[model samples]
Target: DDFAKLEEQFDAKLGIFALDTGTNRTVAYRPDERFAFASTIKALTVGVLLQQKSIEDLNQRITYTRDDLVNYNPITEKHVDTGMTLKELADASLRYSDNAAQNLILKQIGGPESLKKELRKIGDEVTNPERFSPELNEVNPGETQDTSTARALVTSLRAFALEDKLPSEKRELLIDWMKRNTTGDALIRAGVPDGWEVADKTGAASYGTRNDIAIIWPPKGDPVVLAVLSSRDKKDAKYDDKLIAEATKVVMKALN
Candidate 1:
């Protein structure tokens, strides 16, 4: 419903939806298909690690070597500290989209293969349900890291928010980590009222893609799940802005 309005206002290969588990209802477009997960996959990595280890235990330190350094978005690399704990790594990886932090977490969590197994165990593996193997390897210098369906991604987030299925301590940890995500540079944050308490993350890369998933905690109700996945024309910045702005406006209007 909201997505159709945004489509009319923007030039984008846009997919978006809102899921309300309380009502057993979902509203969206292209919600079933898969899209590349840019940095947002960091959230999954964080969850897996928190499930396996205690993030708040300050005695634990994740050391970073030169090999752990990946090219961070210029905006993030400048702001976030490189040396971080398991807690800080999860926070920086999600809040700042820090590539270095993400890699460190990835390495600590046993890389993609181990993470894949964890996701599968939780039934959270959305696209490419098979194990992570040589087949999922990147072929280019700056390729997008992974792929996920909007439904799967949002469902995982919703589960994280509800705390229904995971261990209570782990669920609380996941919620705390997500709440600490301060980055509001993209679609998810753009959609909500000021101080609305949105637990969200964004993903982007070449191929004109922008992916955002959020749990918007309103004043008097259960948090609302909103996710947007877009692919724009690489040639036009205007085209990109239109898509982003429309996504923001549509979701905001829907909640109203």
Candidate 2:
């Protein structure tokens, strides 16, 4: 068997993949299926800027007014009057899934198109992110924009997070923030066993969509990387945090 047989009942469609780095083995179900990137794209958004600017340069400020904020901008909204460092924006974007911070980071690189370009730069032809935050979360089934396959995402994540292709400092900045991310507590983190370090990025959107991609470090061996993406049919469908966790649980179970 490629993996274990497991799933909880739900009306959601799902895609998942887990790579055991120690053995170069992977277990997956519908891994090539398309799914929205949601805020999970923040990891790469932060990655693009890291490649474009210097570490000290990210310390520069990006001032914004109240009118500039968008939906789900908890972190940036608090700093509307004062402004925050670019590094802070990146940190907020990843750790908090701050939409305002993400859009601002997108602006620094050009726009929503820049992230797509960076995706291609890393040879990821399957992930396409077209809209700005909020709008980016809309999962219109037939659309390609704001969509990526589990395989493509993990491949890019390997380049962006796992591999040595990126600078140590840059990788450390993104990974550390992901490790400290406040959003994924019940997603991938809840599924894995104890003592396995989890650093993940999560996304929640309309249509019951919930996504989490992570770099997991086990206690005794090499790291494991995984992505669990799911979505229900209705726009108002409930976000199933357990679906994500269980899907991740099954994948990790198979790998072991």
Candidate 3:
């Protein structure tokens, strides 16, 4: 497959998993290697929060003080003094990958420990979230930050897509948020067919760690679930984006 060729072309460590829901066919390449979660972890935080609180609860407003500020947050830049609903915050977190909004949601849901617990309950034992937002740069000289494996992420995304875990409306809303995600326009969604729909989260850290996980709903077939993680010793945003898009194109062709 072209995916194998693409994998061989890169010097970076990469992990990919794609599942065809229609035929239950799966393809994996280094699916067990762990990578930093980056903003992609927001999906789990949002999912867990929705499970604990009703949609009505998302309507409740929360103020954002200076203490809540983090790097790369458009929400706080626009609505700092004023407050916004949890739903709005979640929208910013997922759609824009807003750092402050993610931290706020994490704090609202009882922090990283709570997210880890929720992931475990859903049978995801390998992923871990140990720090708040902006701490990605604060990792110890010899330690790792929040991490997740391609297989573990695919498992979580599959459960989120196929299980009866979340209420119908909540699940749809979460998927909708991902579909409307603005930050990942050039990553996984870039290679999707014209009529297909993609719900995904993207992650990028310093150096060359770029990752994405998604559930793709084809116009005429069952959805495809995919997770791709990459880490290089150097930074190359354009190259990483193209890598994900090309890999997704290959997966889409195979599935359809």
Candidate 4:
């Protein structure tokens, strides 16, 4: 109800799918449509290593060069020559949204196509990542690149975060990284109530695309998983963080 109304004022469209983890209740709006993935793809890019059984070491020191770097690599840029642990890179990608660290990890894990195949392995056959880093951030003329439906995203997140697609310890580690995600405060976090807890990934791209997928634990009720993908038709349109926040508010209000 509110999703379409919000679209009217913002001159944009929205796609959302939310599940109450305890009740199996759901709220959806344009759940099957596609939207650009932006930086949110970083979780699985790093999680591919977490899902593997024979990772020799998370602390193995790794390094990169100038040719393998991009902007928004806060932590990775500082330690280019010196290098850091594999786990550190994973944490930065989730926490700092470090593109360079993510691109480096993509190279290590067999690049973009390999990760897309891995998504198929886990039954998320919809979310596609054809390019790595900055290139994945673009929205092509006819079809958007690196796209996913809101429904598929929640199911995929459910497979890993709640349905045991990943090992216990590693799953906990990944969720912890998500819980500490510092980039989403104004996105999904801004919308929920004070007592609820949120662990999520925020995605942003050209053409006013902004997304946030989350596992939210309400104060007294069960936890809920939500995916909100918001985008505009025009290139000059603004990225409205408040639009996402208010959308989350209406959903939370209706669910309770």
Largest lDDT belongs to which candidate?
2
lDDT tens readout by residue for model 4, 1-256: 6888999978788989999888888999999989887888887777786786344577788877777678678888889788877888889888889998888888777888888889899988889889988889787535745988889888888777767777777878788899899999998899987767888898898889989988898887777989998889886567888888888997887788
The 10-residue segment of model 2 with minimum total lDDT is 1-10
Ranking according to TM-score, highest score first: 2, 4, 3, 1
Per-residue lDDT of 158-195 in model 2, one digit per residue for the tens?
78787865798888888899999999999999998877
lDDT of each: 0.64, 0.86, 0.81, 0.84
Regarding lDDT, does 2 or 3 come out ahead? 2
What candidate 3 gets wrong by more than 4 Å, as runs, is: 7-10, 137-144, 235-239
Sorted on lDDT, highest at the top, how do the candidates line up?
A: 2, 4, 3, 1
Cα TM-score per model: 0.80, 0.95, 0.92, 0.95
RMSD of 2: 1.8
lDDT string for model 3 (1-256, tens) is 6766776776566778888878999888788776776778888888888888999999989888877886888876688778878999999999889899988889898889888898899898987889988775333222445887788888887787566778888998899999999988888888887668889999887547778899988887788889988776554433368888887787777665
Query: Model 1: per-residue lDDT, tens digit, 1-256?
Result: 6566666666566767687655556666787756666666777777777777753562377665655555663333443444556776667777777777777667777877787788787777573322232223221223334677788888777765575545687777667766667655456666566787877777665456667777777776767787787765552323354465567666656555
Q: What lDDT does candidate 4 reach at residue 169?
A: 77
Q: Count the backbone clashes (under 3 Å) in each candidate.
A: 0, 0, 0, 0
